[PDB]
Amino acid sequence: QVMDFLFEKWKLYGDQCHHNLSLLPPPTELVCNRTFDKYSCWPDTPANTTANISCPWYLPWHHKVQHRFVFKRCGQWVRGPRGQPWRDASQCQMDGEEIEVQKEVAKMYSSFQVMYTVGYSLSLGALLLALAILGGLSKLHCTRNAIHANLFASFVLKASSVLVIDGLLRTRYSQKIGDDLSVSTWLSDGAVAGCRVAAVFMQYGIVANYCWLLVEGLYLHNLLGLATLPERSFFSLYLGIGWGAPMLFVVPWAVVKCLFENVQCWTSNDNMGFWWILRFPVFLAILINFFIFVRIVQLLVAKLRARQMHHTDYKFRLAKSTLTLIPLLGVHEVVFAFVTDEHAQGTLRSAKLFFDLFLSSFQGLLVAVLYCFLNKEVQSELRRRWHRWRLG
Amino acid sequence: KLVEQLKMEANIDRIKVSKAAADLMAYCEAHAKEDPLLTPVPASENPFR
Amino acid sequence: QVQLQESGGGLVQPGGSLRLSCAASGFTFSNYKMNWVRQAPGKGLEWVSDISQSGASISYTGSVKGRFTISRDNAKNTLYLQMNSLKPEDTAVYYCARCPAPFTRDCFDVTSTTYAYRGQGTQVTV
Amino acid sequence: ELDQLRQEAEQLKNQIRDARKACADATLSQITNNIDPVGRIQMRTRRTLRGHLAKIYAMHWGTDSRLLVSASQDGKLIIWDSYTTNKVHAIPLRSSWVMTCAYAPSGNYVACGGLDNICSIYNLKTREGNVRVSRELAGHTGYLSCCRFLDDNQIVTSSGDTTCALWDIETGQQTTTFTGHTGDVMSLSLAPDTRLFVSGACDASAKLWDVREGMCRQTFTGHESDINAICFFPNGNAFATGSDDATCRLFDLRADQELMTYSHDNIICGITSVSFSKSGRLLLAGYDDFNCNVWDALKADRAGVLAGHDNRVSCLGVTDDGMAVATGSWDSFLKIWN
Amino acid sequence: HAQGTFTSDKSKYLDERAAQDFVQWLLD
Amino acid sequence: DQRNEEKAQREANKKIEKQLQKDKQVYRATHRLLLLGAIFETKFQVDKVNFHMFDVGAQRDERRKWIQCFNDVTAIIFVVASSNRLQAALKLFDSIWNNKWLRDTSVILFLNKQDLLASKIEDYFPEFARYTTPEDATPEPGEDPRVTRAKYFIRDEFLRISTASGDGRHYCYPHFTCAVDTENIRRVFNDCRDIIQRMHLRQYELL
Ligand SMILES: *C(=O)CC[C@H](NC(=O)CCCCCCCCCCCCCCC)C(=O)O
């Protein structure tokens, strides 16, 4: 992204400095000595804070300081402050508000990261508790509970991949730079394979989660779209959409994007086409699920007015159904998905990211808590086992 | 009229309840040793491992 | 076995407000629901009234509503039926029916066939 | 000339009742005071048999305790295995509301019936390998409750016409007819000597019948509600049954009185499955509380609960040698205990 | 999607901070 | 040796398991009903839906014991044939609604005769005059609305009895047949579809 071009510019500065030193013959008579300096190469006449030196060009910012001249005292160059590793007082500094705005966005990112870390930790705890207490007794294991367990496993895999890539990124970028060999082996290949596989794993897990949400919506529509029960279990196509379809989309992105523009870590999108390829399964798992949700709400409204009179009590049932149906189908992100992330100002983009992370981070916890404790079957099964334990 | 079998049925001729209870006790204790439900037999001879 | 004996029938003048009661023996009175079934001469059996174990679920048909009163006591283990407003077309025979389902009201007493938990019946006429 | 007959019958019943009270001068409780209780018994499911589709109401164990037959409302008769899990035979039943099944002592015949007035009989041994239909009986006026095999050629079926039956394969119709019940027969069992069998009705009455004489000899009126299940002791001199009022009474053939009472206040669910053990020490009784209870035959104390059933337990099966106990329920799951 | 853009932004900021650390290291 | 067992029975078990899947998929598609009220089995298909009718009249009119078998049926069709007698039908409906085994089964109600054939109410009911007709759809002929008062009253009574112990477990679908004498199966199919949809909603805790 930036570090590799920075290293290339630094190497270009270094070998043009070597070329200039080779071209320039050594001086015969001098007042103050000349030595090589890593930061800047300024072989000039002996003068005390009089010679003009331009700012180095191997910096992320170069045009903002190219109009400012720095004056440095010339025996040895930095011998003026009477120190071999000491440095002069005048440098090519960065703008004043830049450090403040970077600190502010860093604090915002840290707060967002700890917030969704707590959210994912609670969600993973609830999901593992639900997976431990469901499916291990062989009493209510049916097609619907099997699909729910598959969705919970996909959520667990996505959360684990996110945590793994977060930990790997933190451990990789936590170490500072103290030697040329350290940064050279940091930017070299071999240590980025873990980053690449973590990125492709988290993308595959998120796409699998979206595909499983689409599978849940399709199953709900199929159940409330037929007068009679299904003839037989139909796991094949649901498993194909939930598992086979995600690798039909994620793998071409990895193959083409690495072939076209290789990045040091794959979690950095520069071309919007590659991002839209992965967004296409996401945008076809929301527009159909919203239609399914609308049909379900219409059916509920029709069915709660004919047989039973409203008597002002239908509003509470409708609100409860909407509140228990929004997190499962993932229809609450449609308000934020209308506007793309490319066309968004900074405050609006930050707020949209905050709301999206807040809603998606507690999705797994909400759905697990709801469909594990508010479900009547699981809580009714638990009382029987508790009574069996109490009897003994 | 319809009550005709009751006159013939009056031959139950009970002897003593305690004798029948003692006979039941003897039958229960005689087959107690050969009862798999009474004690957990080892799984070596059990074909339901 | 179950015993269901009732007395207090016969022929009486209309408006006498005589009391008819049935006695239940051989089974728990409170644990089993009690129903009143009558059979008109030349017609099928008809249900009269029922009383729950607690005594709150009391219902009457369209012909004996209001005029008929039933009382339940646990000490005497007997059921009382207060029959009033005698009419010539109300003559029938009454059985002190018993519901054989404890703590549940899934039983049949209105069928014309004989029942295993019904009394012999006494003739009632004006 | 009807009231005097009823009065005479009531007087005779009262005389018999006081004669029974005078004869029963001692109770079984004071005799079993010195018997060590069997203690708590742990029950576990060795294996789970699955493959059915609907509810199961009755099942019969095999003579060799290797193969068992179960009847389901789906219309399929599946024969399971005890040592292993794999099935052997699957008999497509013509009737879609079968409620009972029977297994021949020789193992060459099976029976079924219920809610169709037809007792279909099939054979398991044939040259082709596929089961066929032997004959169909259409001489009943009520739903069949349960069917049992006296011998390889004799079958007794109880129907909903408040009468019993005795069918013969070669004859084609009932040899003799048993009449005298006042209620619908729900279940019946056979003694080990195959001479005495009882049949419980909905009038809280149990009657003893003779296969040869054809006339009733013993009548028991010690119950309060309808009788759902009944079974004999391995001795054959006594039997016990469980009615809907959550109690069990152990009747005696010689003694015309109730011997033991198994009523419990903590449970009110009815009893629809009653069976004994090899030695008769344990009385396994089904219940509607999604579990089975084991009652001692000498102390009337619970010594183990066979909980773990999804639905209500409807059928109970204990082998002749007491090798294992099989429990069925309305769910399509079968569990074998030990 | 929601998480990917945030992760990319965090990676970009981390790389920028690494570039600033490199500049400071050569500034000593 | 004894290797014949897991060389013959291993495939003998699974050669019939494939047919068991076919049996399951043909049994699940069929819908089971119960014609209770007023020659043994009827098979018909309406809008590619397998319907397997269960009408029984051979045994006696004692449904105390054998009614527990009809627990897996989709719905129970009730016939009143009112054209005393109504008291027995009301008692049967109350027993069906209050039955613990039948608490999960919905009942379909037909408030007219079943023979498809083209009047004392105040004597058999103490309150008839102090009744108001519901604000439902008026009959198409619109002639003599007095006779419709009795059917509205009995429909309201049946609805009240159903709602007394119908808290979500099962529901009632009253109907008035013999108006067209042709559309008598479409209403049953619609009621069955509604019952299946409500059961699916209950499995998803959305109702
Ligand atoms: C960017 O701004 C850095 C923000 C930073 N936050 C933290 O360091 C706090 C969270 C630490 C990570 C906790 C979750 C990851 C655990 C990794 C180890 C386990 C991996 C496998 C899990 C299954 C702060 O410096 O501001």
Short summary:
The PDB classes it as structural protein. Chain C is mainly beta.
Structural summary, described in words:
Chain B: Keywords: Acetylation, Cell membrane, Lipoprotein, Membrane, Methylation, Prenylation, Transducer. Chain B: This is Guanine nucleotide-binding protein G(I)/G(S)/G(O) subunit gamma-2. Chain B: Belongs to the G protein gamma family. Chain B: It is a lipid-anchor. Chain B: It is found in: Cell membrane. The complex is a heterohexamer of chains A (392), B (49), C (126), D (338), E (28) and F (207). Chain A has 392 residues and is mostly helical. Chain A has a single domain (96-391), classed as Rhopdopsin 7-helix transmembrane proteins (Up-down Bundle). Helices cover 62% and strands 0% of the residues of chain A. Chain B has 49 residues and is mainly α. Chain B has one domain. Chain B is built from two helices and no strands. The N and C termini of chain B lie far apart (62 Å). Chain C is an all-beta fold. Chain C is globular and about 40 Å long. A six-stranded mixed sheet of chain C has the order 2-10-9-4-5-6, with no helix packed on it. In chain C, strands 1-3-8-7 form a four-stranded antiparallel sheet, with no helix packed on it. Chain C has one domain (3-124): Immunoglobulin-like, CATH 2.60.40. By secondary structure, chain E is mainly alpha-helical. Chains in contact: A-D, A-E, A-F, B-D, C-D, C-F, D-F. The interface between A and E is medium-sized, with 43 and 27 residues. Residues 106, 109-110, 113-114, 117, 160, 163-164, 166-167, 170 of chain A line the site of N-hexadecanoyl-L-glutamic acid.
What does the overall shape of chain B look like?
Answer: elongated
Remind me, CATH topology of chain D?
Methylamine Dehydrogenase, Chain H
Oligomeric assembly = heterohexamer
Q: How far is the N terminus from the C terminus of chain D?
A: 60 Å
Q: Please count the beta strands of chain B (DSSP E, at least 2 residues each).
A: 0
**What is the helical fraction of chain B, as a range of percent?**
25-40%
Second CATH tier, the architecture of chain D: 7 Propeller
The first-level CATH class of chain D is given as Mainly Beta
Question: What proportion strand of chain B?
Answer: under 5%
Listing every helix as H and every strand as E from the N terminus to the C terminus, the arrangement of chain D reads: HEEEEEEEEEEEEEEEEEEEEEEEEEE
The structural class of chain D is mainly beta
Question: Strand count, sense and closure of the main sheet of chain D?
Answer: 4 strands, antiparallel
GO cellular component, one term (chain F): plasma membrane
EC number (chain F): 3.6.5.-
Pfam family, one (chain F): G-alpha
Membrane topology (chain F): Lipid-anchor
